[PDB]
Amino acid sequence: TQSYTNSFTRGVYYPDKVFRSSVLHSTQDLFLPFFSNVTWFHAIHVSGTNGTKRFDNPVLPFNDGVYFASTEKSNIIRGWIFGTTLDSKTQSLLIVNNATNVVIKVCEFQFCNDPFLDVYYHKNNKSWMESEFRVYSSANNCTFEYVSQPFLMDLEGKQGNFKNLREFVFKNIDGYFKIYSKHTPINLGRDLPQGFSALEPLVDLPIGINITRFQTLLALHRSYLTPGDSSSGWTAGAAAYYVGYLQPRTFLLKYNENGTITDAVDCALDPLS
Amino acid sequence: ETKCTLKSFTVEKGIYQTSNFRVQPTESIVRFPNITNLCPFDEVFNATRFASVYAWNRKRISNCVADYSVLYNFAPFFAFKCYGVSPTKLNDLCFTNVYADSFVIRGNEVSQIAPGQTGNIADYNYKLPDDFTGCVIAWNSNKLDSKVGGNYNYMYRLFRKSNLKPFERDISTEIYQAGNKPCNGVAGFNCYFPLRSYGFRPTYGVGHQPYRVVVLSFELLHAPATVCGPKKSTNLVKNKCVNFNFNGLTGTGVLTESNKKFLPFQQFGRDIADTTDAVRDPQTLEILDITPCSFGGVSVITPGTNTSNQVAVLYQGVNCTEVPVAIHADQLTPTWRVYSTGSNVFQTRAGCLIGAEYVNNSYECDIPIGAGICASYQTQ
Amino acid sequence: SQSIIAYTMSLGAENSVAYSNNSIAIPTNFTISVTTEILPVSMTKTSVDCTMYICGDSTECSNLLLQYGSFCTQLKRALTGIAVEQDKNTQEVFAQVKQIYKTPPIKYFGGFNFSQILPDPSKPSKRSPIEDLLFNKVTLLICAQKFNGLTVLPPLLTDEMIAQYTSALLAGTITSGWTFGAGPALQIPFPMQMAYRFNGIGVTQNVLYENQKLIANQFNSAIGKIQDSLSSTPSALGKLQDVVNHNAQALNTLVKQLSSKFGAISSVLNDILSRLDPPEAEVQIDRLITGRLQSLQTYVTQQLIRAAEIRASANLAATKMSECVLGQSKRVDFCGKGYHLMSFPQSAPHGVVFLHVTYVPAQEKNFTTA
Amino acid sequence: DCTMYICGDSTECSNLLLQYGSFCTQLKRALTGIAVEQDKNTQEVFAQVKQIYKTPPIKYFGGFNFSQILPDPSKPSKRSPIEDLLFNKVTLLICAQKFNGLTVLPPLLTDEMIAQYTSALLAGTITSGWTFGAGPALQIPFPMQMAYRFNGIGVTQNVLYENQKLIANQFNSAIG
Amino acid sequence: LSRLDPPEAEVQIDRLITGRLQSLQTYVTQQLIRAAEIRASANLAATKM
Ligand SMILES: *[C@@H]1O[C@H](CO)[C@@H](O[C@@H]2O[C@H](CO)[C@@H](O)[C@H](O)[C@H]2NC(C)=O)[C@H](O)[C@H]1NC(C)=O
Ligand SMILES: *[C@@H]1O[C@H](CO)[C@@H](O[C@@H]2O[C@H](CO)[C@@H](O)[C@H](O)[C@H]2NC(C)=O)[C@H](O)[C@H]1NC(C)=O
Ligand SMILES: *[C@@H]1O[C@H](CO)[C@@H](O[C@@H]2O[C@H](CO)[C@@H](O)[C@H](O)[C@H]2NC(C)=O)[C@H](O)[C@H]1NC(C)=O
Ligand SMILES: *[C@@H]1O[C@H](CO)[C@@H](O[C@@H]2O[C@H](CO)[C@@H](O)[C@H](O)[C@H]2NC(C)=O)[C@H](O)[C@H]1NC(C)=O
Ligand SMILES: *[C@@H]1O[C@H](CO)[C@@H](O)[C@H](O)[C@H]1NC(C)=O
Ligand SMILES: *[C@@H]1O[C@H](CO)[C@@H](O)[C@H](O)[C@H]1NC(C)=O
Ligand SMILES: *[C@@H]1O[C@H](CO)[C@@H](O)[C@H](O)[C@H]1NC(C)=O
Ligand SMILES: *[C@@H]1O[C@H](CO)[C@@H](O)[C@H](O)[C@H]1NC(C)=O
Ligand SMILES: *[C@@H]1O[C@H](CO)[C@@H](O)[C@H](O)[C@H]1NC(C)=O
Ligand SMILES: *[C@@H]1O[C@H](CO)[C@@H](O)[C@H](O)[C@H]1NC(C)=O
Ligand SMILES: *[C@@H]1O[C@H](CO)[C@@H](O)[C@H](O)[C@H]1NC(C)=O
Ligand SMILES: *[C@@H]1O[C@H](CO)[C@@H](O)[C@H](O)[C@H]1NC(C)=O
Ligand SMILES: *[C@@H]1O[C@H](CO)[C@@H](O)[C@H](O)[C@H]1NC(C)=O
């Protein structure tokens, strides 16, 4: 599935650790350009009785950070993997969280197995997990284990109509890997609402490796409301899985009295701006 | 003071500005983080062997209290050059996560370890950026690690395509193409191995005596501090001018319980002009507002010294109640305190007036103070 | 259907008149009108400490600063003459009379209505309604932030003394005509004063004593319109607001200049003194200090130029108060557009507002002359 | 422009210049008030009247000769002989060199608009005397306007009408 | 830029930039003074007209 859309006002995060109140401050960092386009990738589950391949983990060049968004009720994506080769020749990185905790292991993996997919794929009765951990086969000489608190616990959805947007921005710069997160509870009517919400920082980790590609880890064992369409190019559809790139732009941020970034304006979009 | 500032022995009638007054600090406080774990520099030092330069090692030290004084108990340091920090004051700073790169290499090229230096060490085997803020240590290692038959654990990269960037490692094991002849073979002419061994003969002189070398790249940024020097915390003091040293942020001012809801990742409360308005206590997660001391200007109201020799003092822009607190022995920049709390201290919108008597009459303005207030020299 | 359109200007509405070698047009009716005019008189009084601003109470920086020379001595001297000049300007514009006249208890000036400009005793401050409008219209933790060595001094004459001068002038000019500017004040009824003022511009007295009621009604209507004209128009007081904006932005840039490295390791003196030894921190301090000196010098130079620019307008306002108010002016297009009759000098923050009363011919008719 | 002048579009020079401070922003804001001040000066000197009067097609002003100052419609630009002489007397690859960052902005009022204001003032003062500054214009023939002007300076009216021819001749001689 | 390395050329650029800054500052100050001088005569001409 290939589709394009527009990111109205998404991709604003706190540049550093400092407090301000009622201040119009300018910064020049890597942000998501305003009113840009983000590609759409959708899970394809067709003919669950047979073993037809899906292959919804395409390579992505990872040009200077990534902004990722999803609207899944359950943890359909359980993590991500990052690597220039994703093999044992070089170093690779893995970030996956189970029901208890999270695991981040920059390690030399001989080879990573495909995301857990069952041939029956009986989503009607596949609401449980069993033997869904054997990934990446074995490991090698590696360090920097960060077994710690997981990222998302749950955002309880009641009476429906409450898809929980989850936004994560990942950036690797000067030897550090930083992840900022935000969970917007209300979905309203549109898939990607036109509002403003800052991205509080979540984690910084001092890895310092070479990265030029990443892949997504989905729970392919169970999947619903993920059909397939043959649209390619500038089309429309549904993805529930959005990816966009970052650019070195100059922004102007408005800190209110309470300290929250209420609004921001770009400095290279419109002559009025 | 007025005579001194006018550079004259005779002053005419008028109001003159001489200097400023500042309240001085009364005591000092120090608050360092909650840690007692020692850092293992001996692991880097008391090591059975050092990885050679061709693949430099890297160890991270953090979340531990460190004391570099014990470093002086190990060996005499051959160079011990700290580039961006005073070596003496290394025990008064708090850092984020220091680094460490250890290796044994010949001591005749130690001078190549510098930002933008020359030679193989600084060009084709290692490099430091123009933003290095740390130190370099070395000590003799010829006798300890050498071989009469020739120690060959130190094949170092010497051929490569372009000068390797600082803080990057290259471990490409390949036969460099050094000529027109295609280097598809294992070895031969115009196909040279970039790595050359060393003749670490213990009988050799200081010409090629290898030394152990450690490079520390201190990490300096506005971030939570993990490693710290060997100091002892104290008790914070509120509503009193103290020389606070919160986590290495030297300053001066009064502290109050702040009223701004910091976020859990928020650390400072900076504002315009790079002033740390608010800060959070490292020991207990409590936030505080910093307010500068009471400061102001002083002016001397005098009639002509030809007529008399009496003066009055006006403190500009300070409440009269704060002056007696400011009034002590050697407590202000005008260290004299003859007036102190003297003749009918009168409060005016312009400031605090000392040495004059308010009257309930009115005349022409002789010497103007301000806000509709003038002064004059009159009997009774 | 709104859009942006570009065009050439129009130099007013075209008009032509008939010139014949025996013909003349004479007016038959007149019209009184009231015009407002706004002049800045004085700006804020500031003062600066050199050592405190340049160096944050560090002794070594103080030693270097005193080693460079006596620059901040004269930089402090320059800012002292400006304050004396501002006090002199405010002294000069208003204090033209050395008496304080008072209005009579019974206020009936031959049918005229001056209650819109006379002092109001019911209000806690004895201002006037137009003065209240002018005060409310101009908008004056940010101020407390500018205490890095910078200070602002208060005016010598508060607003109350200015109001008393204004009221004294306005009472004298309506009770004694224009004779209180030459010698002792001489009382005179208002209608005779207005008859004199018409006779000044070539209209005989036998006009006013017939059209007294009409003239009074026109006068009252004009004054009534002035208040709404001042309030409704947005940028009427555009000249008394530029002063505060210029002051605030100059001080803001000056205080913000401290957050600049000028090619140094850090922008805070204490961190430099804590990280480095004396003989190496000397070069950092030396590189840091010069930028602050240049910023301070630029500030004082612009202050000097702006003070001279303000002084020119202060002198002009003093001259207008001397001529238009204390007498009748024959100068064309000086005290209002038209033939000049009277003026009223209301006060306003950092300035003064004149109300000029004029006389414009209204209804014309052409005859043949010889 | 500060950056173009200081730095020949180099990146490193740009970085150093921006780390120096807010100097050139202040210089740019300083060189802007002057331009508006010049425009206001030119507007204030000339734009005194809001009407555009015109001379009658026939020009017989009681014997006086204003042909030296009134606009000449024959010329390509409607100036006057004195204006043409003044404009030609003042002498204005020199300009092309001064483009290293420097720029010269154009005047807001073109010369033709200034000429139109000048002609409007000069026609109004001849036709309506001085009453077009107070209120509505009031026409009056020139000889009694000059009678009024002599009556101003203490010479009675019975001098002009007697010496009209001599006065006109002297006027023409001086203006020539 | 072409003949020398960055770390050595930075001091050269710092030496080259300050003179140009001072020249620009002097130019703008002179323009300000001359503008005030011209404004005086403009006001005089307006009064005469
Ligand atoms: C008044 O009327 C016009 C101008 O208002 C003039 O009459 C012209 O005078 C010139 C010079 O004497 C002659 O060359 C013209 O031939 C006259 N016009 C006509 C139509 O003959 C003159 O100023 C006065 N003329 C009269 C008749 O009163
Ligand atoms: C001059 O103009 C005034 C104002 O237009 C005229 O006064 C008006 O006269 C009419 C008729 O008497 C009244 O109904 C109006 O109320 C008057 N206006 C005011 C404001 O009082 C005046 O009549 C005109 N002069 C002459 C000679 O007619
Ligand atoms: C002078 O003019 C003022 C302004 O209108 C008059 O004050 C008004 O008086 C009437 C009746 O007394 C009130 O209804 C209005 O509310 C008053 N105006 C205001 C703004 O309060 C005053 O009466 C006039 N005096 C004379 C003698 O004519
Ligand atoms: C007004 O003055 C002009 C200017 O001299 C006169 O024009 C001249 O007329 C004579 C005779 O027609 C010519 O010889 C001159 O060459 C003209 N001057 C120019 C500059 O061309 C004009 O005749 C005068 N008119 C009146 C009514 O006096
Ligand atoms: C960006 O995506 C839009 C669709 O939202 C598409 O029309 C456009 O061609 C894309 N590329 C751009 C704007 O460069
Ligand atoms: C989740 O992963 C952690 C990390 O190894 C592990 O300790 C824990 O047992 C796991 N929980 C499961 C598999 O339910
Ligand atoms: C990763 O290695 C490639 C291989 O040459 C290199 O081009 C790239 O710059 C490296 N990544 C980083 C961040 O330097
Ligand atoms: C700031 O947060 C408090 C916390 O309850 C809230 O009451 C207040 O309305 C907030 N301010 C604004 C401007 O929303
Ligand atoms: C560490 O914190 C606890 C309370 O959180 C406190 O009682 C203890 O004294 C602290 N340790 C030091 C060394 O200050
Ligand atoms: C002091 O004053 C007296 C009288 O006022 C005068 O005679 C004398 O010369 C003065 N002395 C000085 C030094 O001014
Ligand atoms: C000075 O401090 C006292 C202490 O309460 C206060 O009452 C007084 O109002 C202050 N001075 C002024 C001018 O407010
Ligand atoms: C002087 O006047 C003030 C005005 O409030 C009053 O409070 C004070 O008591 C008066 N003093 C004398 C001695 O009358
Ligand atoms: C008065 O002037 C008008 C034009 O303004 C004209 O039409 C009229 O004829 C003139 N009066 C006489 C009596 O000619």
Author numbering:
A (entry chain C): 25 to 297
B (entry chain A): 298 to 677
C (entry chain C): 689 to 828, 849 to 1078
D (entry chain B): 737 to 828, 849 to 932
E (entry chain B): 981 to 1029
Paper text:
Owing to multiple mutations to the spike protein, including in the receptor-binding domain (RBD) and N-terminal domain, Omicron BA.1 infection can result in substantial NAb evasion. The Omicron variants that have emerged more recently contain similar RBD sequences to BA.2, with the addition of L452 and F486 substitutions—L452Q in BA.2.12.1, L452M in BA.2.13 and L452R/F486V in BA.4 and BA.5—and exhibit a transmission advantage over BA. We expressed and purified the prefusion-stabilized trimeric ectodomains of BA.1, BA.2, BA.3, BA.2.12.1, BA.2.13 and BA.4/BA.5 spike (S-trimer). We determined the cryo-electron microscopy (cryo-EM) structures of these S-trimers at overall resolutions of 3.1–3.5 Å.
